[PDB]
Amino acid sequence: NQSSLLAEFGDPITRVENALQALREGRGVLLLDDEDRENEGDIIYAVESLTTAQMALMIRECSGIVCLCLTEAQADRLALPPMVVTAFTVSIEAKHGVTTGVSAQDRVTTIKTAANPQAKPEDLARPGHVFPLRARAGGVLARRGHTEGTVDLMQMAGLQPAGVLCELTNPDGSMAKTPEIIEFGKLHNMPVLTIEDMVQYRIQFDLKL
Amino acid sequence: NQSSLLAEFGDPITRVENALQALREGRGVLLLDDEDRENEGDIIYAVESLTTAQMALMIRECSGIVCLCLTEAQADRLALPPMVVNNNNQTAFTVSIEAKHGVTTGVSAQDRVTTIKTAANPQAKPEDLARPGHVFPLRARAGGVLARRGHTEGTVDLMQMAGLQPAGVLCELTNPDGSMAKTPEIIEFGKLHNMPVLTIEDMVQYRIQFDLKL
Ligand SMILES: O=C(CO)[C@H](O)[C@H](O)COP(=O)(O)O
Ligand SMILES: O=C(CO)[C@H](O)[C@H](O)COP(=O)(O)O
């Protein structure tokens, strides 16, 4: 019946296709994981089109713990080890062009700095107010997380392989469920899709990335 | 200027007394640090009376990076050292945490309250907490706002001065457009949500004036 609720966004393959196009157009999407996993919907944006206004929306509508999903190669490049001996690294801040690091603009500056393919460890102070996540190799076919869905979506869309996520939260602090996620998506012109949709699509189109 | 804007909340001593009373009554307060420092206002709540609705407000109106201010002793008993050994205002983040039990994903208002009360428990054991997580503990410096003029110390000092458990939560008030709230917006927020506004300088002077060594 999640399946049935999502029918106004199309069938599974169409739900992926439209999410890919929204991303290529610099818009965001809403990605749900398995109902028996976190059963949460995250706003997802591409780093390369990311704006202050998009970041502000995440902060105002989501948990506020905005994460940067990176490939393992990029995380390694940044010398970001895991926070602890979900693949949270130590937290990060831009050294240049920010103040406290927490404003929407500051977080976006931090994020663009980290996602740069020419980035260096020393571009980033640690700890900070952006929370990077290492996407596992293989993506959603290997681990069915929002982290992997984020990076696969960018890759599948032909975009810089870095994205930001944050979990949609209702005003009263409870986590948003499918009906709320659907309404939020229609109000914000953001396609909704599931991790399972992405799994099926990758295989259906022989998408090794 | 900031003085004249704050004068409606009363003189510096009164501003502190009203905040201490708010906390004793289970309500929140708004704490500003120095204008030449972060120049930001944090919502502050006592852990011992913390509710889901209070947490929910912080998530709506603040950065969403809700931090738990702990004594160094409490952080040690949880096995929470500094997140980074060579910290690049020297904010004393530990590794992030989650309740081991009694939560699902950790991020809902209710789950963050559960993690926070689990962590702040003075009989807490390290295994009560998973790491990493979605609550951000901060190690307050010994000596409080007379050691470091931060929101972190302000939070723990306010709890001690009010005679509560020395554990509080903070989060930075954010404007609808993503920029951080400044004094005028913090003042309006306080008057809208019935939260006393005070500054770190108020706390410093209060503590000196009232021989409050803590
Ligand atoms: O923990 C989280 C990051 O703060 C969120 O639950 C987010 O959805 C990423 O998790 P995953 O990749 O496991 O789905
Ligand atoms: O970094 C922060 C928490 O994530 C905020 O800026 C917080 O106010 C830090 O407090 P302090 O004033 O103690 O540095």
Curated annotation (Swiss-Prot), chain B:
Mg(2+) 1 binds at E38. Mg(2+) 2 binds at E38, H151. It catalyses: D-ribulose 5-phosphate = (2S)-2-hydroxy-3-oxobutyl phosphate + formate + H(+). InterPro entries: DHBP_synth_RibB-like_a/b_dom, DHBP_synthase_RibB. GO terms for biological process: riboflavin biosynthetic process. One of its GO terms (cellular component) is cytosol. Its cofactor is Mg(2+); Mn(2+). Keywords: Lyase, Magnesium, Manganese, Metal-binding, Riboflavin biosynthesis. Its EC number is 4.1.99.12. Binds 2 divalent metal cations per subunit. Magnesium or manganese. The record marks H134, E172 as: Essential for catalytic activity. D-ribulose 5-phosphate binds at R37, E38, D42, R148, R149, G150, H151, T152, E172. One of its GO terms (molecular function) is magnesium ion binding. It comes from the Bacteria. Gene3D superfamilies: DHBP synthase (3.90.870.10). Pfam families: DHBP_synthase. It is an enzyme of class 4 (lyase). Pathway: Cofactor biosynthesis; riboflavin biosynthesis; 2-hydroxy-3-oxobutyl phosphate from D-ribulose 5-phosphate: step 1/1. PANTHER family: 3,4-DIHYDROXY-2-BUTANONE 4-PHOSPHATE SYNTHASE, GTP CYCLOHYDROLASE II-RELATED. Catalyzes the conversion of D-ribulose 5-phosphate to formate and 3,4-dihydroxy-2-butanone 4-phosphate. NCBIfam families: ribB. Belongs to the DHBP synthase family. Homodimer. This is 3,4-dihydroxy-2-butanone 4-phosphate synthase. The lineage of its organism: Bacteria, Pseudomonadati, Pseudomonadota, Gammaproteobacteria, Vibrionales. The gene is ribB.
